[PDB]
Amino acid sequence: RSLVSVHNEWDPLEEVIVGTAVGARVPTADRSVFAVEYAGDYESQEQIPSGAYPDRVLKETEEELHVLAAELTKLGVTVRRPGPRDHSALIKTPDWETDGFHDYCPRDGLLSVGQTIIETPMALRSRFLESLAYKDLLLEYFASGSRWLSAPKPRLTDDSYAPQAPAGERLTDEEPVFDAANVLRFGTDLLYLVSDSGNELGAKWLQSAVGDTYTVHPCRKLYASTHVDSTIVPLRPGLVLTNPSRVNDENMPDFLRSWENITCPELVDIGFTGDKPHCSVWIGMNLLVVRPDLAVVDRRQTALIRLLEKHGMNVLPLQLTHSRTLGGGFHCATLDVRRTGALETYQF
Amino acid sequence: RSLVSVHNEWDPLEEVIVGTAVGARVPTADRSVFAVEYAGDYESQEQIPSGAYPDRVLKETEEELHVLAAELTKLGVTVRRPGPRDHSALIKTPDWETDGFHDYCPRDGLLSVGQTIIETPMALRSRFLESLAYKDLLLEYFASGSRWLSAPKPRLTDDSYAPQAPAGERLTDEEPVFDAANVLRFGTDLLYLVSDSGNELGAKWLQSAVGDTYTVHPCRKLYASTHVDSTIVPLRPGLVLTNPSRVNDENMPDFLRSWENITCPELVDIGFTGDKPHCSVWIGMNLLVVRPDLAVVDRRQTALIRLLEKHGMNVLPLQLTHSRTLGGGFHCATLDVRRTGALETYQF
Numbered sequence: 001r002s003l004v005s006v007h008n009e010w011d012p013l014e015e016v017i018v019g020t021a022v023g024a025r026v027p028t029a030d031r032s033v034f035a036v037e038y039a040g041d042y043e044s045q046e047q048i049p050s051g052a053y054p055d056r057v058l059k060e061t062e063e064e065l066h067v068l069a070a071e072l073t074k075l076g077v078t079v080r081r082p083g084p085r086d087h088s089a090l091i092k093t094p095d096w097e098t099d100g101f102h103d104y105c106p107r108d109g110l111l112s113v114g115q116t117i118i119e120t121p122m123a124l125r126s127r128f129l130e131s132l133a134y135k136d137l138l139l140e141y142f143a144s145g146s147r148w149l150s151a152p153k154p155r156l157t158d159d160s161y162a163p164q165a166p167a168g169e170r171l172t173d174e175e176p177v178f179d180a181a182n183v184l185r186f187g188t189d190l191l192y193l194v195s196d197s198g199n200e201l202g203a204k205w206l207q208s209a210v211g212d213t214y215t216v217h218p219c220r221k222l223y224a225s226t227h228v229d230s231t232i233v234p235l236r237p238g239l240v241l242t243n244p245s246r247v248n249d250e251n252m253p254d255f256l257r258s259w260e261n262i263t264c265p266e267l268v269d270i271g272f273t274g275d276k277p278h279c280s281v282w283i284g285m286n287l288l289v290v291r292p293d294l295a296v297v298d299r300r301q302t303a304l305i306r307l308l309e310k311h312g313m314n315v316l317p318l319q320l321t322h323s324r325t326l327g328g329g330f331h332c333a334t335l336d337v338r339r340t341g342a343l344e345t346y347q348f
Numbered sequence: 349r350s351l352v353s354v355h356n357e358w359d360p361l362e363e364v365i366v367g368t369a370v371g372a373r374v375p376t377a378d379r380s381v382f383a384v385e386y387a388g389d390y391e392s393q394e395q396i397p398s399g400a401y402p403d404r405v406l407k408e409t410e411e412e413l414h415v416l417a418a419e420l421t422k423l424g425v426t427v428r429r430p431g432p433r434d435h436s437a438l439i440k441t442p443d444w445e446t447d448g449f450h451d452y453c454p455r456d457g458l459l460s461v462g463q464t465i466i467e468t469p470m471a472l473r474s475r476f477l478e479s480l481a482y483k484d485l486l487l488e489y490f491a492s493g494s495r496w497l498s499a500p501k502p503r504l505t506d507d508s509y510a511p512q513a514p515a516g517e518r519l520t521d522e523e524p525v526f527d528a529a530n531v532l533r534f535g536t537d538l539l540y541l542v543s544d545s546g547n548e549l550g551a552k553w554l555q556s557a558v559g560d561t562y563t564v565h566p567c568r569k570l571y572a573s574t575h576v577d578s579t580i581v582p583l584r585p586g587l588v589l590t591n592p593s594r595v596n597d598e599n600m601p602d603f604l605r606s607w608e609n610i611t612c613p614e615l616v617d618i619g620f621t622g623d624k625p626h627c628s629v630w631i632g633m634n635l636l637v638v639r640p641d642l643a644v645v646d647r648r649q650t651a652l653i654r655l656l657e658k659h660g661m662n663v664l665p666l667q668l669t670h671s672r673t674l675g676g677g678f679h680c681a682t683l684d685v686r687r688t689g690a691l692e693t694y695q696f
Contacts, residue, residue: 085442086442089441089442090440090442091440091441091442092438092439092440092441092445093439093477093480094433094434094437094438094439094448094477094480095480097440100442119500129441129442129501131500131501132441132442132503135503135523138500139523142524142552142553147556147557148500148553148556149497149498149500149557150497150498150499150500150501151497151498152467152479152486152496152497152498153467153477153479153498153501155480155483174487175483175487176490176496201490204490204491205490205496208495208496209495209497
């Protein structure tokens, strides 16, 4: 009886992983971090604000983070947190050198598709050994019958990046690279956004690793530059929330065309602490569905909670203050390893 | 029509990978290299002879290596060679730091079980990014329909090693670790030698990655301390060559008990250049079967060539002079990516 059993984004959550803010940082300046994350706000990679986030943001989001875990426990969910890791410790391969990121977004490079966990081949050199903080959880999952796979570790030479190109095109297609957060899971159907943090070869590879049961749907016309997370948010079978500045009627994936679609209201601008914000105001949409009638939304998105309730979706409004600074909402900041339920196909 | 299709050790070779001696070195002294390779000849890891092998050995084996590629080409096999890589370039993770090994033994950390290639989780930190020299080949294989997987990259902390234990017990069982060269492939049945370069969890993991079709047979009573390569040598279905100092009648794996077994004659001691030899005289047995009736054997093993011919096995005797120095025979120094044939079960 594997501990990892999960087929979609909305069934009744049994066990999740939450994630800390403890040594969060901005890696050293570098082609890849520049090309995938900051080459739209800064003139050159040497202007990226490398360094550790201010203590105030890590303190405050760590207590917010404690509340999330607390309430999910109250709801009956089993909460697991990351192991300790130094993010300033250097990582160095024959081709390049860097420091680490943070362990605030477990969603990003760990993908759970059934009884299997896949360590994806992340676009950023700093996240080269992303799963190191989770070795003990994984090991336990493994010893319980969960299948545990990894994608080949990428070369990630200068040629895989294209700072100067237009957005959603600065990640070349030389090898399978993709963050897990570029994939969304609707049972058999797997949606894969091809953008600045995941190429075509990555979805080529994603398909072979999960096999014929599932069908990977790569998308290159949505305007997400990086993760699908705050662009398409499924809520229960047959109802999906979309980002109106990005997805439209000529956009929408084909297997989702039958689901009823509710357009997100324009969000409140929670602030940002910095020079330039790290995330678009659309992390307001980064919600986490607990069961088909329960979802966690930031309590300042009163337009958004209203709407969700109008469609018979009860909310539990918690708050993540530094979301635009660290770039992570409830979904980015969690990883669901088991939801009660079975494997099905939602095309109506 | 994937370029990677191979079910066993002896069917008719179509495409192989050969491998250079170009920048071969002995890594910097370190717990893992000491525990898995030198802790039976040296008093402590600080005595290991780190450094680049003498030019004479690399020059001479590289021309010998040119002849091997030349003759297999003559036989109609497609020969591919590794890419260029600096082995002195440092590799550094949060836990440790090192320089690389060599790209002379493609067999060791790349496993081809059907249409799939598995980058195994190598026991030595210097071989942490073993597959980097092969990125372009694998990329091509990948783009051709071959399934391309990797085992989770190991933490490989001080806890996974046990210098002071008896041989075949200095690699603890904390996480799936195992070199591909610890596995031997007889179609459905996969023999996995559990020893100093591969644990029980590695075979636990190996089973999950390949699935129910195959059955992994872990072995802890053969006396190989590292690789199964020069201990059990299948030659054609129903005939296996065994190492008499290691395997016997109370040893032999159960699915092999029906195959007829021929005992290896005592070999010629080709020399070693160094202080202490790097491989046992039994690399004389590291032969490479090209087809069921053709095998490549070092031409100084005249007892062995005779015997093989006695059992209707034709040999093509080439020579690898520095085999006890670099530790690689014809099998260690090659990687077969495709043999003409199909998937079967040889239990008679």
